[PDB]
């Protein structure tokens, strides 16, 4: 029994060991209560404004659309405290953790932006924070490890499996199944068992709400499409939610194509996997013929995940949102282009969304289109990775 629908069509649910069901039910009740509590909403709003720096800017690109009929805005979640959209919902979940009398936080992180967010919120709100991070990600997103540790979080490298995000997710859930009495699992994406996909959307939906207000102010109409990268699905659902009922507005989600879909080295299960049950949810996933979960791949740690949030799977199934992929090389070109032509260093995750917008423009340069890309984070964490690649490339 639940208060809210755990499913989006066929996708979602609560596929966790029985031990964890009371914890999920408790969290759902706390969320429902909080959502109708003016004091909670005021506390959350105050943190978003005065601590995190909302609202974030909506920046019109001045150079990269030259000679085309595309107008491109970037929603600047890169300017949020911590450097990515992840901060928004962490502040809300941390307040929930305190609503529930929890003193410790568990989080998983891939890019380390959710880890940085969990650490900073824990430092502010007086919680003891431990973060699981795949060992491969500890290396390729090292600046965030340093940041998490300086803020007093425990960072636990995970060497099992692919040593990436899914492995961090596994360890976080294993931990929570023993520690839920005192620890809140601050899941960092719009995936996992109900109520997380719902909570994460509701605590990220200000992205799209602000975007709508800003684009109306500046253009006097809604976008033709909003475009966001999709790992687990939080930044994209946060951008999409307020537009779902605006049927004219395209919703485009961009999964990582890695070395190319045909290579099998990608993170695009929504479009190139099949439905399975893992990480507490029924959702598309990359899996072997026998139903073992496959390891994903992306140049970007934040998108290196073999599943996707159930609401995205649902929005795709009914044709409300469209999902595409962008390869490592396409993302790298978009990264370089934004740095050199707009003076913004984007996260490699966000670069996938930008790359798709650039393709939409370049493929049809006389098509009139008003586009918004969710620039989900800044690329400080990625600069050493991108340097090493462009160097080995001979640039």
């Amino acid at each position: 029994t639940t208060l809210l629908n755990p499913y989006f069509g066929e996708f979602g649910g609560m596929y966790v060991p029985q031990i964890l069901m009371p914890a999920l039910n408790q969290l759902e009740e706390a969320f429902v209560s909080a959502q109708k509590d003016p004091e909670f909403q005021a506390q959350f709003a105050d943190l978003l404004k005065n601590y995190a720096g909302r609202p974030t800017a909506l920046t019109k690109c001045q150079n990269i659309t030259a000679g085309t009929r595309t107008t491109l805005y970037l929603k600047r979640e890169d300017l949020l405290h911590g450097g990515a959209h992840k901060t928004n919902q962490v502040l809300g979940q941390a307040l929930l953790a305190k609503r529930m009398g929890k003193s410790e936080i568990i989080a998983e992180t891939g890019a380390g932006q959710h880890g940085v967010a969990s650490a900073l919120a824990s430092a502010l709100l007086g919680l003891k924070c431990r973060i699981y991070m795949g060992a491969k990600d500890v290396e390729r997103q090292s600046p965030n490890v340093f940041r998490m540790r300086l803020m007093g979080a425990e960072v636990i490298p995970v060497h099992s499996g692919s040593a990436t995000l899914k492995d961090a997710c596994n360890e976080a859930l294993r931990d929570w199944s023993g520690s839920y009495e005192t620890a809140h699992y601050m899941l960092g994406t719009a995936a996992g068992p109900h109520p997380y996909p719902t909570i994460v959307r509701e605590f990220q939906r200000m992205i799209g709400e602000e975007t709508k207000a800003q684009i109306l102010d500046k253009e006097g109409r809604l976008p033709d499409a909003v475009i966001a990268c999709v790992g687990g699905g939080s930044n994209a659902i946060g951008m999409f939610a307020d537009f779902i009922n605006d049927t004219s507005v395209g919703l485009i989600g961009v999964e990582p194509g890695g070395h190319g879909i045909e290579t099998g080295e990608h993170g695009a299960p929504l479009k190139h996997g099949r439905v399975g049950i893992y990480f507490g949810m029924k959702a598309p996933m990359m899996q072997t013929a026998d139903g073992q979960i496959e390891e994903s791949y992306s140049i970007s740690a934040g998108l290196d995940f073999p599943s996707v949030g159930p609401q995205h799977a649902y929005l795709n199934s009914i044709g409300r949102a469209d999902y595409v992929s962008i390869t490592d090389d396409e993302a790298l070109e978009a990264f370089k282009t934004l740095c050199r032509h707009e003076g913004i260093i984007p996260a490699l995750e966000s670069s996938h969304a930008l790359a798709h917008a650039l393709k939409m423009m370049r493929e049809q340069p006389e098509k009139e289109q008003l586009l918004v890309v969710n620039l989900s984070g800044r690329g400080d964490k990625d600069i050493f990775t991108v340097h090493d690649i462009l160097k080995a490339r001979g640039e």
């Binding site: 031990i19 859930l173 294993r174 199944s177 893992y278 026998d290």
Partner: protein, 268 residues
Amino acid sequence: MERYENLFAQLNDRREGAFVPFVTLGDPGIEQSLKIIDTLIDAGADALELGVPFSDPLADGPTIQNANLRAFAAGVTPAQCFEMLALIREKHPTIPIGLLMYANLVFNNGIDAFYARCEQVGVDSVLVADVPVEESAPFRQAALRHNIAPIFICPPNADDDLLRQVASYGRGYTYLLSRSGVTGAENRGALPLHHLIEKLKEYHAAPALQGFGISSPEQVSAAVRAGAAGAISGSAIVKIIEKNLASPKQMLAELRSFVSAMKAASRA
């Protein structure tokens, strides 16, 4: 079939609890796994809990994680596990055999087909670790359609509604979780909570087997004394495999010794 029902009636008559080892099928290889299982039975195992290797076993701690990894290193697949199960049943017609499954392996190419295969090879029960009662409908329906007992979990944090559902939906045995957390011998669970055992009995639940962190004869005795029908031990058994990989003979000897001691403790 009625293998669990028959076993529990026999144990009841002998005033004994069940001792039920867990191992991963195909750990450390198919042939050695079959020998391990024969040893477990010869040494006094009353029933078996057998894991099908899964890529991401989220209810398992490092010991059984590593058992899964060893089986994968030997190239073990679910198809090969079903071949093994058929061979085991061929040798041992009455011992109850339960599988420890993760949902994706059951769901993968059709829930119905999975349970149909279980029936074909003569499995008696299936415990899907990451499917709570709330999500269980298609699993338990397919199980019952194919004469398989669906196993459900009574955690220490069980409320009355859960107790009633577990009693109603479950067959074969009820899993009485020792503690929160994941599988592992280092993490010792509590004594079976008598309140839960006596509520399960009130609601006519399948007999309770206590599991998680059971690694010593003392704990098996204590489970019996507390009113549980028996006890499951996994990590403790798997550790003996892990310790003796280069010594297959010693491995079987130590397994026999341990199982015999655990079984001896079940006798009241």
